[PDB]
């Protein structure tokens, strides 16, 4: 009745097998009950006192774990490194030969037997490269309908009907570059398109990496971090599912490879990324999306057509876009003043729409009550730049938050559960009482661009 266990090594044409047991390799014969053809390398085999294989089960689930270094060209062996940097050339079991194993993978091995059984997932490597689930939708973004259409055309359509593209032999876009004034909603568009692609498939994966997080004190770490990020992206996309990689605040890292900063390591970081996008090895289902409020500071090598070929310019919202944003951030469920509710006879939607219209009319006006800045150009002409030329979406959010805070103060002072239009009207002028980083030093680059649009160089900036 008692029976031992052993590790199968290989099969022979003589209907004989090799079994590792008790630290020794032996030549055995399979029992007539079992079929020698069904045997697989590394499979546990049940032995007996007569040293005959009678049954083969699954693979061993316990033992040491080693880091994979390389796969030998023969395709049946792998070089791995032990815990104490001891290097072993171990056999690969049948399950090892998802995606093919890469260097750095952890394998369950037993040194005495010398076989690699199972690839053991590691939580640390998964945590190193974050993959969150975006929740922002196209509804949350207003006033950028044409930009949403463009990003749908450059991302959604190639994967909706990719068979049509293959029939037309069209290559799906490989890079999208969002640029514009700060606070205009660069990250929201990327999050929305990622969420839409995630819902569209019926599976995708999204990688978000920030700018400063790719900076290290030593030399040679940012490049290997980028290499690991792109290796993860390739691993995820090898199954055929599209993968989106988003670089946030590309202005800070990998600037112009020329003069740029007088003391920076940038000259050795941008080419690596270039080699990760265009090179002898070409990624297949990876889309790189970059967002930077300073498009002129980005490396022209990155901006070359073929890498980040799609270029979208976000612009500051106008009056209609401001109304759209206010409608997005003001819902029917929001409490309103009882007087307005009585005036609208319970038509809450009409009340909030009218309040939004009044607010956006107040914000966009040439009256000297909404003066923001005084600009003197090279010709010497003084022009009053009002809020109309600096109505960013984040500014609208701050206005709404301040108005809601004023409403909280009013309801805690009086007790009536409502929101007054005068609250938002006062918040409009109280928004610029505190700095919103819109004003800057003598000659900012944004104001230089605005002057280039105007045609006369801006020389004097005065707070009003």
């Amino acid at each position: 009745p008692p029976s031992g266990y052993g590790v199968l090594l290989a099969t022979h044409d003589d209907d004989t097998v090799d079994v590792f047991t008790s630290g020794r390799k032996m030549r055995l014969t399979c029992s007539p009950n079992i079929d020698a053809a069904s045997l697989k390398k590394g499979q546990t085999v049940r032995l007996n006192e007569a040293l005959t294989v009678v049954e083969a089960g699954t693979f061993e689930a316990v033992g040491e774990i080693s880091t994979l270094r390389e796969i030998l060209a023969d395709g049946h062996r792998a070089l791995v490194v032990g815990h104490a940097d001891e290097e072993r050339v171990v056999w690969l079991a049948d399950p090892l030969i998802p995606r093919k194993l890469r260097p750095g993978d952890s394998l369950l091995v037993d040194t005495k037997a010398g076989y690699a059984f199972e690839r053991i997932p590691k939580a640390e490597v998964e945590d190193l490269v974050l993959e969150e689930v975006p929740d922002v939708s196209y509804a949350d973004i207003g006033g950028l309908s044409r930009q949403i259409e463009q990003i749908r055309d450059a991302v959604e359509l190639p994967f909706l009907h990719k068979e049509l593209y293959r029939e037309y032999s069209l290559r799906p876009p490989k890079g999208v570059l969002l640029y514009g004034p700060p606070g205009c909603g660069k990250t929201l568009i990327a999050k929305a398109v990622a969420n839409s692609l995630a819902k569209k498939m019926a599976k995708s994966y999204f990688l978000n990496i920030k700018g400063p997080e790719l900076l290290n004190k030593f030399v040679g770490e940012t490049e290997r971090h980028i290499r690991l990020i792109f290796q993860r992206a390739r691993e995820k996309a090898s199954e055929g599912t599209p993968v989106i990689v988003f670089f946030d605040e590309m202005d800070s890292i990998f600037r112009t490879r020329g003069t740029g900063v007088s003391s920076d390591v940038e000259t050795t970081v941008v080419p690596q990324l270039l080699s990760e996008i265009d090179g002898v090895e070409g990624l297949e289902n990876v889309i790189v999306i970059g967002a930077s409020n300073r498009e002129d500071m980005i490396d022209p090598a990155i901006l070359r057509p073929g890498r980040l070929d799609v270029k979208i310019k976000i612009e500051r919202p106008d009056a209609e876009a401001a109304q759209d944003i206010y409608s997005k951030y003001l819902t029917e469920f929001l409490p309103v003043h009882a007087d307005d509710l009585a005036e609208f006879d319970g038509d809450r939607s009409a009340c909030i729409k009218a309040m939004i219209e009044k607010v956006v009319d107040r914000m966009y006006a040439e009256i000297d009550d909404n003066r923001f800045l005084e600009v003197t150009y090279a010709n010497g002409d003084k022009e009053v730049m009002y809020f109309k030329d600096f109505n960013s979406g984040a500014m609208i959010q701050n206005v709404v938050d301040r108005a809601k805070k004023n409403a909280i103060k009013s309801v805690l002072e009086t007790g009536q559960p409502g929101l007054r239009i005068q609250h938002l009207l006062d918040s409009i002028v109280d928004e610029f009482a505190e700095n919103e980083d819109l004003p800057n030093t003598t000659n900012p680059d944004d104001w230089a661009r605005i002057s280039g649009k105007k045609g006369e160089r801006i020389v004097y900036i005065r707070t009003l």
Partner: peptide
């Protein structure tokens, strides 16, 4: 504003059989 290169210092370790 400068980069560095690391030199390792091996720690003592010994096992039996």
């Amino acid at each position: 504003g400068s980069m560095a290169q690391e030199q390792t210092k091996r720690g003592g370790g010994g096992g039996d059989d």
